[PDB]
Point group: C5
Chain length 311, copies 5
């Protein structure tokens, strides 16, 4: 067992195909996903040619160890894939048709900029390193790239599973490597973030704003501080489900902006009380009256500015 | 070792049967469960037939490697099942009776719409891909589908373990695939949600409503805000034990609706105080008196509307 | 290698023995425990008998693959046990003495009714399936059932490790199955629950009762609500360390009952203030005075009733 | 391959040695640690003895399967160790020098009594079970017991890695067993507990004591209750990182004692207010004045008593 | 298969090189990281040399088992690396060129002193133990040390992957051990700590300082205590994501220092009220006025002192 030799001096083409069966565990924090799929491989090995007449059988079946099989590996995996050889069929000409079912944890970075309204392009990079006797090249057999209809990935929508037909051939450690890019396009199902995080966060903020219709400092201090604590809780909850990004996320921006609102409202509440004690409730009253409009207006404007910057 | 050949040109029938031994780890968030069961396979291989009289042995036992065994795989699994071959028995007519005990982590989506009063149909999909020499078809031997009496799945009730007799036969990557659907029907034991989540959540809400029998703004602000924080806690606790759904759940709806109640009660408490400071306690008094009835009534009506929509 | 044939037509007795080495990870939520023990198997295989004299050896040693060894499996395990064959000894009469050291994750349900003052009976079910040529039966060699003195199971006391001598024989998928029940009797070390959960929970409740010696509504609302939140925290902490039971637990009952106390105390606090505002502090004063005795009395009575029902 | 036979009727001495390479994951809750070390085994097998002059070679090499190797196992492990045979060298007299590198998860109970100022003695128990032909005995080759300089165990100090030279020889299931005790002495790096848990816990308690310099019941109720909630948080945080002990820990004692302080302070704060409302501020004033001294004094005395009992 | 013998009496040089493919899971608490890379080994084995003319091939391919391959191990790993042999090529002069792709969990301590503004040097220690026939020594083939462009480590910046050319040779259990140090230089992406932890922590502290512009003790007690609770939350959140260090961290210092600020502010708040009740608001007023400047000034100075000490 060693590579099939060239007729002329051409490189060996291994036709590939990935057919998704299962998609699960898209971990945001880890930027990983688990995949269970069929990996199909085809190449001509003339050494394996046979006469169906002389051997009875139209197609021969081989055990992995019996024949030369190309060393196909995934680039962006945690550990080497768990594979089970489903079948190895050889036609009389020596054309090998290899099928395996595999499972792997794929490392694919995510762009959290538009979270939870983001979409992603997951990658599965197939690779072959060239042997000494001959160069091995990868190719996509589009007939063998797909996914089953039941492929669901919890809390995401699957747009497309396609392969970039042209491999990336390059040198690595004094040998040629032929790499293919399989692309899984998905979009996050943002629905649940609305009643679980967005609306509750807004409600608590709006409740803080009731202090603009109160002259009671002690009640205001309670209203603003208490809701700020509930906001910290939401911030912590949100940040625990996301990885630490070197960029500002849409969600991150909003969450942060809201802190400034609580801070300014505390200042207002402090100012209003200070003036009242200092026997000038007229100034205080006009500040409070302005705030009642300013706060919602500035909040609504700021959000428009943000959504614009982010989308 | 290669498939047994057809007498005429009929497909090979593999008689299947799953007998559950253990059911555990139904993870709601992951939408997975662990299973430990017997997998029974039975097909005819004439090449294995023998004389009952001349052999003197009623049945013959083989080692997996000695004979051709169909490649049965599960569709909705995380990784390929962990199997141990228990026994392989061949009768004189060449009927093969294979038995293995396996363990696997099954991927089966759940409908959270009626949580925690929901019922589910877990699936275990058995599959076989046809070979070049012949088409392999799956069949259910109802005599070999079951579960042991002790099979308990913590916090769930096991209604039935049945198999859809008619396999789904279809082409996949230029070969035939025979797929069977094993169904585990279960219903959630909702009992514990009542004293742990439902009642405490109602209690805290009812406690907020005591502010309708108080003229103290500062005490009211404390009553409503404090309980709202306890509600956020329950919401977080509930949402951490559930996956992110693209649909509204019964629980989710209730939890959300309750936020509106806390918000409106804050408005009322603000309104009542505002009118008191503005020297008109008569208007305030009639608003508070109305609220005392409105709040429970609207709450009770809203819940009826919801339960109707959901059940 | 195939089963030893019967002298008459008797079944094959496999003498068993489990000797515990390690006991760890009793997971309450999962209702599992890990075990590391010796498994001893002994049966007669005449085909291996020898003359001690012409051999010049009292005992013969074998490698697993060399001889027929019964397929013993555990019923209530997550995955098939991890075993290492320690030693296989053959006496002149063909008596085989097999020893292996194994590790396994055992599924054994727990009765949470008396938690944290509960005791449990963990099970380890040994099984063997009968073959075509003969019926394989299990037996307990009491000389080979035990545990080492150092076997400790964190936060539990080990009472006894015994085996039910008479195996449960039954047909499962047209073959007789012989099952043995090994029983590990344990009792929970309740000590720590007293200073960590019980007493703190009582302290916070008693602190709520100080509102019966206060006329300040605003301070009372703070006392009762604040402690109720600390109670919710204890409830959450307790419920996270336990599985969801379809029955009421002793702890569960107490925890729940206490909610009613906080609810009623809120009502009292509301009533007392309402009467004070309504210019009738005499009625309020006698209600508060009654509560001061009622609350502790009813609490103490309720607990007596509960402990009775549960123990 | 079978044991080397005795010259006289002496037992087989297997000289052992453990050389630590890595120490990690000391889990307090689990009472486990992970270890990566060299395991060295040496014994005389005369059958292997050769001539140094004629053979030309002064040392002869073997593959595990080629020769008899004693079955050494660890007692206090979760699962059987992961080992890689490094080398097997045989000297002219038949002395075998076996070396393997292994990794294992060790089960070793901890004494939480002095936490976080505790020290521990971790154990690694080596064992050998005697065979039918001969008795196997373990011995410590002190030249082969050690640890590398870089062996660090996060948040612990490594004092010593020594072996108790005299093995524990005893009967187990009608055979002899020889057991060695390897001891890893460590002491907890308590530093971080001071600014993260100790001081914050004291600060919140001292803040509660400011109510002894306040006549405002409503402010006092807030001071004492709020800090008690922060104490419950610290208690929960501390108890989640420790296993459930049947004994009282130093930390446990302090944490609990502090609850009594919050309870008594609540009583004081209630008493002071009650007397004030009852128009006798002189009695109240002298109670508060006494408390100002009593509380710190009793706290300081109680801690001295505790530290004494525990250290 | 045994080591290539020395021409003179020189040690065997094994030329190494690690080429990183994947970098993930830098766990701060565990002080571990996962790595997926190519391991390249090259040594001369003259017993394998050949004439390119007679053989008619300029290279020779071998299966691992066919030839002698040095036992290279990693020092700082949890368990032995998961490796797949990619290729083994022999040149005419008997120069062996080995390549494997491996995955491992590396134990590399981190210096938390400057967190979250820290940089780290991760280590990968390659080792070889010399055999009886000869001494093995490791060397770096700089042409074969690298990383691919896509190598990203979430929340960290990869500065350099270099190897210390000169191995650390030493005696370990009477044999020579040659050790190489591969160094991965990284710097933490501190960005996210600013809007998620730093700023919110400052905001809550600044909000506490509004009590210096209030005469309301009850409102002040609420402001300072409530924010102190939010600070405890941040402290807990921060400490859960870090290991327990025997040294003070920059973050740790700040977090702790801030507690003193809350404590002193409580004292001030208590003093101011005490003076007011004692009918001397003039002294109280000047203390409060001083605090308004003192607090921010001392805070700003203290931070300057700290940043200096730490950077
Ligand atoms: C709290 C502050 C309010 C946050 C709401 C942000 C919604 C948003 O702005 O999200 C916008 C996204 C759509 O973005 P997209 O389809 O990926 O657009 C990508 C293509 N181009 C042209 C924009 C580049 O949401 C939705 O379709 C529904 C949002 C409902 C949210 C209701 C509340
Ligand atoms: C907080 C608001 C109250 C929530 C209570 C909802 C109960 C409910 O509405 O649940 C209804 C479920 C029964 O639903 P089902 O048997 O699956 O009906 C499916 C079939 N058809 C005709 C409805 C479609 O509960 C119970 O049997 C007991 C509920 C006790 C809850 C006590 C509180
Ligand atoms: C908060 C409310 C108080 C809860 C305390 C319940 C204690 C209890 O009632 O527990 C009772 C258990 C004993 O139960 P047993 O030995 O299993 O009895 C089983 C046999 N027969 C006859 C009862 C059936 O506790 C103890 O020995 C010590 C309990 C100390 C708790 C101190 C507080
Ligand atoms: C909150 C209440 C205060 C708790 C502080 C307890 C400190 C202690 O008491 O700890 C004592 C331990 C030393 O104990 P050891 O070296 O193991 O003594 C074992 C040997 N003989 C004779 C005692 C038996 O701490 C220290 O060296 C430094 C403790 C600094 C804590 C500063 C706060
Ligand atoms: C809350 C208190 C404020 C904490 C802010 C500390 C920032 C700091 O002091 O960090 C300093 C680090 C740079 O340190 P370095 O590049 O590793 O310097 C190592 C080399 N020599 C000469 C110092 C030794 O941050 C930054 O470049 C940006 C920090 C922005 C923080 C904004 C808030
Ligand atoms: F700010 C919101 F739009 O985004 C967040 F708050 C999140 F994550 F969705 F909860
Ligand atoms: F019924 C709703 F309130 O949902 C809650 F009860 C739940 F989910 F069960 F905890
Ligand atoms: F109810 C009592 F038994 O105590 C419980 F609440 C406990 F111990 F926390 F589980
Ligand atoms: F009480 C002291 F021993 O410290 C404890 F509170 C601790 F370390 F925080 F757990
Ligand atoms: F405050 C600085 F010390 O850094 C802190 F904010 C941190 F690490 F982010 F928690």
């Amino acid at each position: 067992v060693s590579p099939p030799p060239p007729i002329a001096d051409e490189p060996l083409t291994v036709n590939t195909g990935i057919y998704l069966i299962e998609c699960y565990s898209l971990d945001d924090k880890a930027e990983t996903f688990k995949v269970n799929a069929f990996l199909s491989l085809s190449w001509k090995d003339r050494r394996l040619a046979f006469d169906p007449v002389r051997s009875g059988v139209r197609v021969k079946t081989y055990e992995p160890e019996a024949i030369w099989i190309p060393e196909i590996r995934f680039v962006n995996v945690e550990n080497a894939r768990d594979a089970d050889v489903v079948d190895i069929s050889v036609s009389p000409d020596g054309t090998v048709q290899y099928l395996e079912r595999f499972s792997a944890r794929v490392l694919s970075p995510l762009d959290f900029r538009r979270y939870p309204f983001d979409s992603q392009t997951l990658h599965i990079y197939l690779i072959v390193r060239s042997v000494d006797t001959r160069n091995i090249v990868l190719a996509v057999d589009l007939e063998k790239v797909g996914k089953n209809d039941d492929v669901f990935l919890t809390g995401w929508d699957i747009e497309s599973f396609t392969a970039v037909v042209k491999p990336a051939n390059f040198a690595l450690e004094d040998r040629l490597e032929s790499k293919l890019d399989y692309q899984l396009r998905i979009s996050r199902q943002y629905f649940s973030y609305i009643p679980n995080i967005i609306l509750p966060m807004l409600f608590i903020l709006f409740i803080s704003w009731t202090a603009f219709w109160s002259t009671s400092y002690e009640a205001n201090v309670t209203l603003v501080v208490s809701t700020l604590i509930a906001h910290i809780a939401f911030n912590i909850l949100v940040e625990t489900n996301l990885p630490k990004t070197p960029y500002m996320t849409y969600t991150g921006a909003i969450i942060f902006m809201i802190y400034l609102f609580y801070f300014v409202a505390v200042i207002e509440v402090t100012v209003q009380h200070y003036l009242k004690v200092e026997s000038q409730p007229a100034r205080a009253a006009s500040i409070t009256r302005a705030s009642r409009i300013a706060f919602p207006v500035v909040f609504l404007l700021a959000n428009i500015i943000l959504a614009f910057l982010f989308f």
